[PDB]
Design an enzyme around this catalytic site. Structure first.
Site, PDB file in Angstrom:
ATOM      1  N   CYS A 156       0.783  -1.236   0.000  1.00 30.85           N
ATOM      2  CA  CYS A 156       0.000   0.000   0.000  1.00 30.85           C
ATOM      3  C   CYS A 156       0.813   1.284   0.000  1.00 30.85           C
ATOM      4  CB  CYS A 156      -1.012   0.037   1.145  1.00 30.85           C
ATOM      5  SG  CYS A 156      -0.196   0.236   2.802  1.00 30.85           S
ATOM      6  N   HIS A 164      -2.242   1.558   7.094  1.00 38.44           N
ATOM      7  CA  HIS A 164      -2.604   1.438   5.711  1.00 38.44           C
ATOM      8  C   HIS A 164      -2.778   2.866   5.189  1.00 38.44           C
ATOM      9  CE1 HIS A 164      -4.366   0.024   2.001  1.00 38.44           C
ATOM     10  NE2 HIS A 164      -5.532   0.602   2.246  1.00 38.44           N
ATOM     11  N   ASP A 179      -8.313   3.557  -3.187  1.00 30.05           N
ATOM     12  CA  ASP A 179      -7.324   2.573  -2.727  1.00 30.05           C
ATOM     13  C   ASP A 179      -7.004   1.669  -3.896  1.00 30.05           C
ATOM     14  OD1 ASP A 179      -5.740   0.843  -1.151  1.00 30.05           O
ATOM     15  OD2 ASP A 179      -7.285   0.694   0.421  1.00 30.05           O
TER      16      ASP A 179
END
Length: 277
Positions: free
Chosen positions: A74, A114, A129
């Site tokens: 991420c 995250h 995302d």
């Protein structure tokens, strides 16, 4: 600092993911970029398994992903994607979340760990995302979504108005199943340095304990969890197969996940490292 990509970088990135004309900022155009990115750039932790440092500076992630035909996790994928979106004229903020995916609401607190993005479009706000892996949403999610819309299987919900606490969730039988929970405090880019250091080097990091990979191909989300190869239709009939040997695993990484692995400096060391999985 979170600055946009250069024009040359923008061009090359766009070409890499198969978009010729990205068009002006809009939800339709954002969704096109997201869908193209999920199909071209795998979620993967191969460098962590090689005990290579994960560097999150712009030019390093650019070189890994676009010039090297590799993916990442991420802090690499969402930061690089954020810099593209800034270069295409979108207005965004960085967010951080605590991951809950696969945990009962009983399980204790998890670390803010995250990165994901808050996009401010003329037509509304969206959570973006491209770097969550197996359970990544296939599009930008309205922030918040509509729990009464049965088409919205992924949905962002305000779960504690007092605390300003949101979740990105998926529709379950027993309720909404959170991917991760977050508040809307905008983040400074330097604060992800210790977060990335932790996931890439802490011995209890899940990313140091086995192979994790994901990519979208056709109607399917393909995943690897160590030697277990999964194909999920997205509504959730999943076929799974234990890979037979490292040779099969390596072929799948290079084909299905589209990763370019150097035949001299990477594949041999990976063949040895992956054999135990």
């Amino acid at each position: 600092h979170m600055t946009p990509l250069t024009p040359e970088q923008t061009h090359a990135y766009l070409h890499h993911i198969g978009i010729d004309d990205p068009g002006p900022p809009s939800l339709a155009n954002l969704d096109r970029l997201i869908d193209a990115h999920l199909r071209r750039v795998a979620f993967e932790n191969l460098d962590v398994l090689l005990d290579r440092p994960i560097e999150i500076d712009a030019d390093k992630v650019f070189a890994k992903v676009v010039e090297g035909s590799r993916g990442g996790y991420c802090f690499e994928l969402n930061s690089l994607f954020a810099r593209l979106l800034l270069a295409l004229g979108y207005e965004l903020e960085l967010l951080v979340a605590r991951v809950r995916w696969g945990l009962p609401d009983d399980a204790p607190l998890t670390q803010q760990s995250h990165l994901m993005l808050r996009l401010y479009l003329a037509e509304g706000e969206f959570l973006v995302d491209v770097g969550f892996g197996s359970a990544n949403p296939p599009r930008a999610l309205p922030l918040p979504g509509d729990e009464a819309d049965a088409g919205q299987v992924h949905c962002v919900r305000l779960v504690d108005p007092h605390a300003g606490l949101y979740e990105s969730a998926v529709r379950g039988r027993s309720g909404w199943l959170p991917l991760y929970r977050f508040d809307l405090r905008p983040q400074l880019w330097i604060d992800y340095i210790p977060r990335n250091w932790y996931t890439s080097t802490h011995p209890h990091s899940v990313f140091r304990q086995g192979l994790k990979a994901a990519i979208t191909e056709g109607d399917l989300r393909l995943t690897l969890a160590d030697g277990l190869f999964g194909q999920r239709a997205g509504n959730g009939e999943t076929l799974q197969r234990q890979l037979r040997d490292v040779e099969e695993l390596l072929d799948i990484l290079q084909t299905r996940f589209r990763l370019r692995l150097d035949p001299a400096s990477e594949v041999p060391a990976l063949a040895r490292r992956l054999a135990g999985l």
